[PDB]
Design an enzyme around this catalytic site. Structure first.
Site, PDB file in Angstrom:
ATOM      1  CG  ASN A 137      -8.548   4.752  51.424  1.00 22.78           C
ATOM      2  OD1 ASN A 137      -7.846   4.061  52.157  1.00 22.78           O
ATOM      3  ND2 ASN A 137      -8.046   5.651  50.590  1.00 22.78           N
ATOM      4  CD  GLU A 166      -0.508 -18.898  35.535  1.00 24.81           C
ATOM      5  OE1 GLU A 166      -1.090 -18.307  36.464  1.00 24.81           O
ATOM      6  OE2 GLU A 166      -1.122 -19.507  34.638  1.00 24.81           O
ATOM      7  N   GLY A 174       0.749  13.738  46.585  1.00 21.76           N
ATOM      8  CA  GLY A 174       1.828  14.240  45.750  1.00 21.76           C
ATOM      9  C   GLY A 174       2.996  13.277  45.666  1.00 21.76           C
ATOM     10  CB  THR A 175       5.152  11.731  48.246  1.00 22.12           C
ATOM     11  OG1 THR A 175       5.555  13.017  48.736  1.00 22.12           O
ATOM     12  CG2 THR A 175       6.355  10.799  48.278  1.00 22.12           C
ATOM     13  CD  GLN A 194       1.418   9.270  56.323  1.00 21.54           C
ATOM     14  OE1 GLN A 194       2.230  10.191  56.382  1.00 21.54           O
ATOM     15  NE2 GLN A 194       1.173   8.465  57.349  1.00 21.54           N
ATOM     16  CG  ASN A 212      -3.079   0.223  55.995  1.00 23.35           C
ATOM     17  OD1 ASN A 212      -3.621   0.402  54.908  1.00 23.35           O
ATOM     18  ND2 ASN A 212      -2.484   1.200  56.667  1.00 23.35           N
ATOM     19  CB  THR A 217      -8.800  12.959  53.292  1.00 23.07           C
ATOM     20  OG1 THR A 217      -8.333  13.753  54.391  1.00 23.07           O
ATOM     21  CG2 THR A 217      -7.651  12.227  52.635  1.00 23.07           C
TER      22      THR A 217
HETATM   23  N1  LIG Z   1      -5.319   2.507  51.751  1.00 19.83           N
HETATM   24  C1  LIG Z   1      -4.747   3.473  52.462  1.00 19.83           C
HETATM   25  N2  LIG Z   1      -4.678   4.740  51.935  1.00 19.83           N
HETATM   26  C2  LIG Z   1      -4.101   5.734  52.641  1.00 19.83           C
HETATM   27  C3  LIG Z   1      -3.569   5.501  53.893  1.00 19.83           C
HETATM   28  N3  LIG Z   1      -3.064   6.662  54.350  1.00 19.83           N
HETATM   29  C4  LIG Z   1      -3.258   7.618  53.416  1.00 19.83           C
HETATM   30  N4  LIG Z   1      -3.909   7.054  52.355  1.00 19.83           N
HETATM   31  C5  LIG Z   1      -4.315   7.712  51.108  1.00 19.83           C
HETATM   32  O1  LIG Z   1      -3.349   8.685  50.789  1.00 19.83           O
HETATM   33  C6  LIG Z   1      -3.955   9.906  50.446  1.00 19.83           C
HETATM   34  C7  LIG Z   1      -3.094  11.036  50.983  1.00 19.83           C
HETATM   35  O2  LIG Z   1      -2.062  11.250  50.053  1.00 19.83           O
HETATM   36  P1  LIG Z   1      -0.598  10.617  50.250  1.00 19.83           P
HETATM   37  O3  LIG Z   1      -0.005  10.158  48.941  1.00 19.83           O
HETATM   38  O4  LIG Z   1      -0.649   9.487  51.243  1.00 19.83           O
HETATM   39  O5  LIG Z   1       0.253  11.820  50.879  1.00 19.83           O
HETATM   40  P2  LIG Z   1       1.838  11.629  50.975  1.00 19.83           P
HETATM   41  O6  LIG Z   1       2.190  10.185  50.760  1.00 19.83           O
HETATM   42  O7  LIG Z   1       2.358  12.149  52.291  1.00 19.83           O
HETATM   43  O8  LIG Z   1       2.389  12.527  49.773  1.00 19.83           O
HETATM   44  P3  LIG Z   1       2.599  14.080  50.080  1.00 19.83           P
HETATM   45  O9  LIG Z   1       1.419  14.533  50.891  1.00 19.83           O
HETATM   46  O10 LIG Z   1       2.700  14.883  48.811  1.00 19.83           O
HETATM   47  O11 LIG Z   1       3.865  14.222  50.884  1.00 19.83           O
HETATM   48  C8  LIG Z   1      -5.343   9.883  51.047  1.00 19.83           C
HETATM   49  O12 LIG Z   1      -6.275  10.415  50.138  1.00 19.83           O
HETATM   50  C9  LIG Z   1      -5.641   8.422  51.284  1.00 19.83           C
HETATM   51  O13 LIG Z   1      -6.553   7.965  50.315  1.00 19.83           O
HETATM   52  C10 LIG Z   1      -3.631   4.230  54.430  1.00 19.83           C
HETATM   53  O14 LIG Z   1      -3.164   4.015  55.545  1.00 19.83           O
HETATM   54  N5  LIG Z   1      -4.225   3.215  53.713  1.00 19.83           N
HETATM   55 MG   LIG Z   2       2.753  14.156  52.712  1.00 20.94          MG
END
Ligand SMILES: Nc1nc2c(ncn2[C@@H]2O[C@H](COP(=O)(O)OP(=O)(O)OP(=O)(O)O)[C@@H](O)[C@H]2O)c(=O)[nH]1
Ligand SMILES: [Mg+2]
Ligand SMILES: Nc1nc2c(ncn2[C@@H]2O[C@H](COP(=O)(O)OP(=O)(O)OP(=O)(O)O)[C@@H](O)[C@H]2O)c(=O)[nH]1
Ligand SMILES: Nc1nc2c(ncn2[C@@H]2O[C@H](COP(=O)(O)OP(=O)(O)O)[C@@H](O)[C@H]2O)c(=O)[nH]1
Ligand SMILES: Nc1nc2c(ncn2[C@@H]2O[C@H](COP(=O)(O)OP(=O)(O)O)[C@@H](O)[C@H]2O)c(=O)[nH]1
Lengths: 430, 50, 154, 427, 429, 427
Positions: free
Chosen positions: A197, A245, A135-136, A11, A219, A170
């Site tokens: 963040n 480099e 997780g992802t 995400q 972002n 979060t």
């Molecule tokens: N810098 C930044 N971090 C983000 C943003 N959105 C989510 N995050 C980070 O991503 C974390 C949430 O976990 P993610 O890895 O994004 O969740 P996911 O990618 O959907 O993976 P799963 O939930 O397992 O499906 C939060 O703790 C945030 O710190 C963003 O727009 N910018």
């Molecule tokens: Mg997710």
């Protein structure tokens, strides 16, 4: 010809990648339809006649962040097979992202990477966008970085990873997924840039006077740092710097590859009328602890190596005067075994402002990507949060029943424990 | 009537068109610019009074 | 795709679909010129006399008239809030504009500014078509059932 | 493409889903007949979570309405929004439970569960990638309690890898509708701790107190209380149906709420509740949704959250809001009263933002709380059950259906083990 | 942002509260419906769009005055649950308002205060309004002020209490309720400003030529005093005086926080044409004892410190020239440990005239709030009335039977006795 | 090229600074927009001493405006020439000192003193070579006195070789704006002695004497006093910004006016202060400037120069003048009354001639004088302090912020140290 492949995991990566390719289209003048009314080669592939397709893969197990790209204003830009989706998300589980539901999508991800690597003649590296808190992002990012190390040896992989903040977070299992992700991004990622963040929220509230910052306003400036990193790949300059480099200057040792990032002239539109942005002035503000993109105080540690990325009207003389004054400053400190510390890069292109955005139109900019010994307290704080949760065996039953064994947490903390002691051992004077 | 649904004259209500718009950064940018213009107008009026 | 119309010259086409999108394309080099996006799915388009406006009616009970340059809806009007708004077409002189809705109504607006001139309601079913006579004498506006309506322009 | 199969249990379950399916149909713009009169394209993108595409643009729910007395089925079908449901999904009995948990679980539950499990199999096999089965039922009756929890049992060995979001109303200390409430509640919790994945606990006595105090509506019916639970059953699966800045489906919520496999009972609440006299004077801001989120009187369980520490918590924010205001307010509630939060877990609160608010609202939020305060409502039902059982009261109505008194002793065992394991994490 | 939370306790609290919020809706242009057709932020909180709601709670145990607000001309102004009502009144009993029925209703009071504190960004103080002659003002006013010290520490609290008159008062048990209140507001209220009904009666007869004044006429010019002392936050001026500034410039010692009050131009419509309301005349009129809001004689005592709040077309030269003449007069006497004894605050907003009121439109106005050792004669006169009460135990079974112990009669008796000694020792040279 | 960094504190410093930046930008030809509209080339030659060149040719003043009350910086945005300032330098508080020295210096001023040093460090490093730091503030207040003297203590420790200019207004003899003036005044002047390189004393009721007796202003506006203050502060920095026959910066004035390090408290006065009725009758000549300069009623301190002998003096002459005829006025004023001049310093008066007069004025002059008569307005404040502190009145609002009674005896003794060393030179 020079090209890079920007992979985005989870995400966090897609929403960064949505803001990144929004700004990359503005830099090369490409409309969102994909048609422009040689600087575009590093990111876009000239396909057929008049169609520019980005060099990226957008993989996520949750469909909801990917179909927004498939429906929104940039749906015509991306190749339909480049955006990879799955049925169900990893759900804050490193084991699900690594073992159960990540194996049926890692094979299809390498297929898109292989066909993108076959298209580019000179592949210069990889840019990975992920968050270790999820997780992802952590789990499937671990599996993709593991496969890319075996499949593509010696090739650069650049870790632009989002990291859990000290006080603001979060999710509850962020200490678990981040420690397990650190066992993977050491041996595979060549140079990793930490992103936090809450430090951006400190930047967004103060430097931009945005009282209510969000992930979109977050972002847009993170997309500026990665765009400033690749500026010499696309435009000319006095002192060109390449992706291979940065590795020859910013990592003194193979196991020290964590970078703190900073962007200097982050000024809103109304503040920009009064402020005079000189090269020496923004260089001073680039080294400010408040202007760091990670929640660290770099006064705590010593700088091992620093690299600077200048864009716009920067003569190579005032950069040399600016680094002389910032070297003599007492509140900053360099480690004794690296007498020279700086790598200077100048790009002739002024920074581009996104329409409807927040950053003002400026003539000069600095992007500092720096290696310091103040990154040890990043891992020490996460080690305290992991040990405080693992002592009473919290949330372990979710990880155990989804492929892992119990002792994998002990391997990951002991691996991070060695990552804690070697930062102090290197940074100690001799 | 409906408990959680407001009564067409409350700050909580949205139109069906309004509840499906998603531009948070854009709306906050517009509010910031409008607030700055209004603050400039207030400062000009106070300057004229002084 | 719901609406489509040739431009003043034969070299350019314009289209409006249900993907919240409408566009102007080149016949020779079969590629997009520019693409305009909306916030609701369209339900009809028309082109005025000599490029001055392209008008689209959506599902969300609103009429949006557009200028080809400067991508922003020039004028949007929410109207006929009883039921949906169905079909539109253009006067050839560029001074009048028809509008049909899922109500029992047909409406006449002006291209410069929306001012209601047409009658209240004749046809039974929701509308399906429009397109004034080429001398602005009348208008055949038709319902969804087997009903056609002949109108004389006041 | 993660769908939800809804299960309706008994008198309370049929009425609570009569208003739940009314809410999400108006949220998705579906008329009472079933056609799509929605006005924008975010509704059409996720209809597969709850409804089914049918011929002619119809949208029919994945709702399996089941009970033992046809009188409740006649009320929901003949009422408004009663034509959306599939007629063949209206499976029902004829004898009726008669408040007997044994009858709903053993005697007449036997010849109806095989009929309703075929409807479950037909609904679950047709759809592609199941997320879980959502069930709404009661623990006080026997139609939706004995038969409802046995549906949870037989569905669990058949689909073990999927979620189970159960909603259960519990008997009240203050006002008792039936006499055998302590007997039916404790025998249903025993089948709920081992089988259900996560449990959302509701109760009637908190809903009357919420409507009297916050909503200033001095005489609630079953209408406005049912619409409150419907306003929260929509909030849990809000991120499935709509995009957001940070999405969270059901398995996002389970991993961040339960640290241990048996601590899966929660307490719920809905944020922007206000009286009609107070609508024009309240402004929807994230600072004031958050303070109404954590208020003890706003919660929808009898257990006061001030008594017990919050083990974990989660927030389901809906609307156009800044994530810093989501992050800072949930950080602020952790530090101002850190004595109310457990110490061996840092950052107890999960947060997630959905970009689409409910119908007619600017911003809304739904709270889920895994607190150790909920041991006092299991304890209070337990002491209701122990007082009746020591004198063999109302047991001849239960032993006549083949249910021996031996299982009552072990039903109180893990009932007391649930409140023992919740207590030892509080210290 | 600068903000206050004005809490009103008792029948006098609501009636003054209903009169002062009418005045506050006039400076900012707020309609009775609540819509204005950045200065309003300290009193009216912007909720949603177009609606401004007051930052006040109206708590009273007797619901016969709260519903009058709920049915009067300001139904749509107030947020309905801000107005807190009770089942029955405290019945002139400090013990009832503090122990029996005041315990259940104070929980709702702190709930609404918690909403108001979180809503506004920067607090500046709590304004209290009560009458210590009644049961609700003495009892519930005490328990509310106990709570605000332990919840919001080190925050300024402003006391505006209607104090019993020497000569004419409407209560019989008024010595009992007053003594028990001062034991609790000595260590709680950071600023206490006494108000005396017979002093304001004497002002209305002479200065306003109203031969038959009521409580409505008295509450209007009391509202002008509160509006002037908060006028600096609302409107820009040459010399801003803050709410936190009042404590730092009026109280030399933490137990001496009782201050007099006087509003200088009190002129009717017919008398305004013949009086040249210059700044030297109104400043001289403020220090005149018959313009004081408390039936006290400051000639008997000596002023410890003074504050002057100026509204309207006042330049800073002739406020300095007017206080130069004041310090030279021997009728006014200053303590030898405070040579410079004035705080001057100048604003540029003339006072607003209420519709149907008796105060005429004026250009310049003064609000003098000053600490003095002559205030000790106010408590000493009510010392004698309580001692005549408690000598043979009259009206005690209403107090002892309703919760409180009779030992608290002597504990509050000894506390005001020490306050009598404290005023007599600070005035000694 | 010899830059002056202006820093303003409190309500008084911002109001003094607002009139100061109006006067200087008028004679430099700088509009409120930010552009340049002058008619002579002499204005742009030395403009970097007070204004930083920005993008687009705009000139932004080198000013740092601070106060703990946020509404006061709204008053400087509302004032004319209020949009020339950089919004970043507008460092603001939230609480407010409220005429408390301790609140501005320890408790509430410490949270803001990090950001003030942050912008001072940024502003000093931008220019090539500093010439000094110029501060205008109050001593009777809480922000200009408490937060000011902490800033003067901080920037003296960090930058020890740079000059210091304090245009501090001091509490008045006759009528006082606030009761607690001697508590703030004595504590401020204790920190001023060992930190400020030179201090310039102003009094408000000495300014009222100028506006009444000399200017014939019947109702002086509060901003008219700042016009007289801004006329002097523009005159001290005259030789830096403009060429002249004899140049003298702030350091050359310090080395001539300060015989011993602790005696750095001056009293000043601007010379050609004439009414509009008497404008046509006075010949604007050098002798008419000199004897009016040395007159007691011109000087903007309550201390009368006739009481004590002059230790040193400084004259800053601007316009078309003769060097001999300027100098012979200085020798004449030292001989006609030789009792008021100290004997062991020959040539007590320094003079500088600048060639560029103020705009619209043919010829002007500015006086700076170190006298032993300035102890009269420090013994008076010590008379006020010894009365209040002996009975320990108004002290709980100071001891509640961390400082004890021993710090009061530090300032009381150090005040009496300065009046002791001034007195022994009067003999
Ligand atoms: N810098 C930044 N971090 C983000 C943003 N959105 C989510 N995050 C980070 O991503 C974390 C949430 O976990 P993610 O890895 O994004 O969740 P996911 O990618 O959907 O993976 P799963 O939930 O397992 O499906 C939060 O703790 C945030 O710190 C963003 O727009 N910018
Ligand atoms: Mg997710
Ligand atoms: N100046 C002024 N004084 C008032 C007003 N209303 C009541 N008082 C004073 O209050 C006294 C009566 O006691 P209260 O405190 O008002 O009684 P209460 O507030 O109803 O409290 P309970 O009697 O216990 O219910 C009278 O003697 C008056 O002096 C008013 O409107 N203006
Ligand atoms: N909230 C709510 N509760 C209900 C409703 N109908 C019944 N109940 C509750 O269910 C409990 C008894 O359940 P019961 O009707 O016997 O379930 P049954 O076995 O299916 O008939 C009572 O305590 C009621 O409070 C309803 O429509 N809404
Ligand atoms: N000459 C002059 N004096 C001023 C001005 N503003 C305030 N003062 C004086 O400063 C003193 C109060 O200082 P103040 O502004 O309250 O300081 P602060 O509270 O610490 O910020 C009073 O005696 C005023 O006479 C001004 O613009 N000009």
């Amino acid at each position: 010809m020079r090209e890079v492949i920007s992979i985005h995991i989870g995400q966090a990566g897609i929403q960064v990648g949505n803001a990144c390719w929004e700004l990359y289209c503005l830099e090369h003048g490409i409309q969102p339809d994909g048609q422009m009314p040689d600087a575009f080669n590093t990111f876009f592939s000239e396909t057929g006649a008049g169609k520019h397709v980005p060099r990226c893969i957008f993989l996520d197990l949750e469909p909801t962040v990917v179909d927004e790209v498939r429906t929104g204003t940039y749906r015509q830009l991306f190749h339909p097979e480049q955006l990879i989706s799955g049925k169900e998300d990893a759900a804050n589980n490193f084991a699900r992202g690594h073992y159960t539901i990540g194996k049926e999508i890692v094979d299809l991800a390498l297929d898109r990477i292989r066909k993108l690597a076959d298209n580019c003649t000179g592949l210069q590296g990889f840019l990975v966008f992920n968050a270790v808190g999820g997780g992802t992002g952590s789990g499937l990012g671990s599996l993709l970085l593991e496969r890319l190390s075996v499949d593509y040896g010696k090739k650069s992989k650049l870790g632009f990873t989002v990291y859990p903040s000290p006080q603001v977070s979060t999710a509850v299992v962020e200490p678990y997924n981040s420690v397990l992700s650190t066992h993977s991004l050491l041996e595979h990622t060549d140079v990793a840039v930490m992103l936090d963040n809450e430090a951006i929220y400190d930047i967004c509230r103060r430097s931009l006077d945005i009282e209510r910052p969000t992930y979109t306003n977050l972002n847009r400036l993170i997309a500026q740092v990665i765009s400033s990193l690749t500026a010499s790949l696309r435009f000319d300059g006095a002192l060109n710097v390449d992706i291979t480099e940065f590795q020859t200057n910013l990592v003194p040792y193979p196991r020290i590859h964590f970078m703190l990032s900073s962007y200097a002239p982050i000024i809103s539109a109304e503040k920009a009328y009064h402020e005079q942005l000189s090269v020496a002035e923004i260089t001073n503000a680039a080294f400010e602890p408040a202007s760091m993109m990670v929640k660290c105080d770099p006064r705590h540690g010593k700088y091992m190596a620093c690299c600077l990325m200048y864009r716009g009207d920067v003569v190579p003389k005032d950069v040399n005067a600016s680094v002389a004054t910032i070297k003599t400053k007492r509140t900053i400190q360099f480690v004794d075994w690296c007498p020279t510390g700086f790598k200077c890069g100048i790009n002739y292109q002024p920074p581009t402002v996104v329409p409807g955005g927040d950053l003002a139109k400026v003539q000069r900019a600095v992007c500092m990507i720096s290696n310091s010994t103040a990154i040890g307290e990043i891992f020490s704080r996460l080690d305290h949060k992991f040990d405080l949760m693992y002592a009473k065996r919290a949330f372990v039953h979710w990880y155990v029943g989804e492929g892992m064994e119990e002792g994998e947490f002990s391997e990951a903390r002991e691996d991070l424990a060695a990552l804690e002691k070697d930062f102090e051992e290197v940074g100690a004077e001799s | 009537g409906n408990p959680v649904m407001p009564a067409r004259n409350a700050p909580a209500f949205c139109d069906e068109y309004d509840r499906f718009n998603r531009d948070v950064a854009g709306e906050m940018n517009a509010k910031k610019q409008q607030n700055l213009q209004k603050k400039e107008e207030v400062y000009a009026v106070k300057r004229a009074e002084q | 795709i719901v609406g489509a119309a040739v431009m003043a010259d034969d070299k350019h086409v314009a289209a409006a679909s249900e993907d919240r999108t409408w566009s102007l394309w080149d016949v020779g080099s079969e590629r997009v010129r520019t693409t305009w996006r909306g916030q609701s799915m369209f339900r009809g388009m028309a082109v005025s006399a000599d490029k001055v406006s392209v008008v689209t009616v959506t599902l969300d009970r609103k009429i949006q008239m557009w200028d080809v340059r400067g991508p922003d809806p020039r004028w949007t009007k929410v109207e006929a809030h009883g039921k949906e708004v169905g079909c539109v077409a253009s006067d050839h002189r560029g001074a009048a504009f028809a509008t049909g809705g899922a109500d029992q109504a047909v409406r006449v607006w002006d291209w410069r500014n929306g001012g209601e001139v047409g009658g209240a309601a004749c046809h039974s079913a929701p509308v399906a078509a429009m397109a004034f006579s080429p001398d602005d004498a009348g208008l055949v506006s038709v319902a969804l059932d087997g009903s056609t309506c002949f109108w004389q322009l006041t | 493409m993660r769908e939800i199969v809804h299960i309706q249990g008994g008198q309370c379950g049929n009425q609570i889903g009569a208003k739940f399916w009314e809410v999400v149909s108006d949220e998705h713009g579906i008329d009472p007949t079933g056609t799509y009169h929605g006005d924008s394209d975010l509704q059409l993108e996720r209809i597969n979570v709850y409804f089914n595409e049918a011929t002619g643009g119809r949208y029919v729910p994945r709702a399996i309405l089941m009970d033992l007395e046809p009188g409740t089925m006649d009320s929901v079908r003949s009422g408004p929004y009663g034509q959306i449901f599939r007629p063949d999904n209206f499976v029902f009995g004829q004898t009726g439970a008669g408040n007997n948990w044994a009858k709903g679980h053993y005697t007449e539950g036997a010849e109806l569960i095989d009929s309703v499990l075929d409807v479950v199999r037909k609904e679950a096999e047709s759809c592609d990638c199941l997320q879980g089965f959502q069930v709404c039922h009661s623990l006080g009756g026997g139609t939706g309690s004995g038969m409802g929890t046995l549906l949870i049992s037989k569905i669990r060995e058949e689909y073990p890898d999927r979620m189970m979001l159960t909603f259960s109303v519990v008997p009240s200390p203050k006002v008792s509708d039936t006499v055998v409430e302590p007997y039916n509640a404790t025998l249903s919790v025993h089948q709920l701790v081992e089988n259900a994945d996560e449990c959302m606990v509701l109760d009637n006595e908190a809903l009357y107190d919420i409507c009297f105090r916050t909503l200033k509506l001095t005489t609630p019916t079953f209408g406005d209380l049912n619409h409150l639970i419907s306003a929260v059953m929509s909030g849990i699966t809000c991120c499935l149906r709509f995009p957001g800045q940070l999405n969270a489906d059901l398995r996002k919520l389970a991993v961040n709420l339960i640290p241990f496999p048996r601590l899966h009972f929660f307490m719920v609440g809905f944020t922007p509740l206000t009286s009609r006299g107070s609508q024009q004077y309240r402004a929807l801001t994230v600072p004031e949704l958050t303070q109404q989120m954590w208020d003890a009187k706003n919660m929808m369980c009898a257990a006061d959250p001030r008594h017990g520490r919050y083990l974990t918590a989660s927030a389901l924010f809906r609307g156009r809001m800044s994530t810093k205001e989501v992050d800072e307010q949930m950080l602020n509630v952790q530090n101002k009263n850190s004595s109310y939060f457990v110490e061996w877990i840092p950052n107890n609160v999960k947060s997630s933002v959905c970009d689409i608010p409910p119908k007619g609202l600017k911003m809304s939020a739904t709270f889920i709380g895994n607190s150790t305060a909920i041991q006092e409502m299991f304890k209070r039902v337990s002491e209701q059950f122990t007082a009746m059982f020591r004198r063999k009261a109302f047991l001849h109505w239960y032993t006549g259906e083949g249910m021996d008194e031996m299982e009552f002793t072990e039903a109180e065992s893990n009932m007391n083990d649930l409140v023992s394991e919740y207590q030892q994490y509080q210290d």
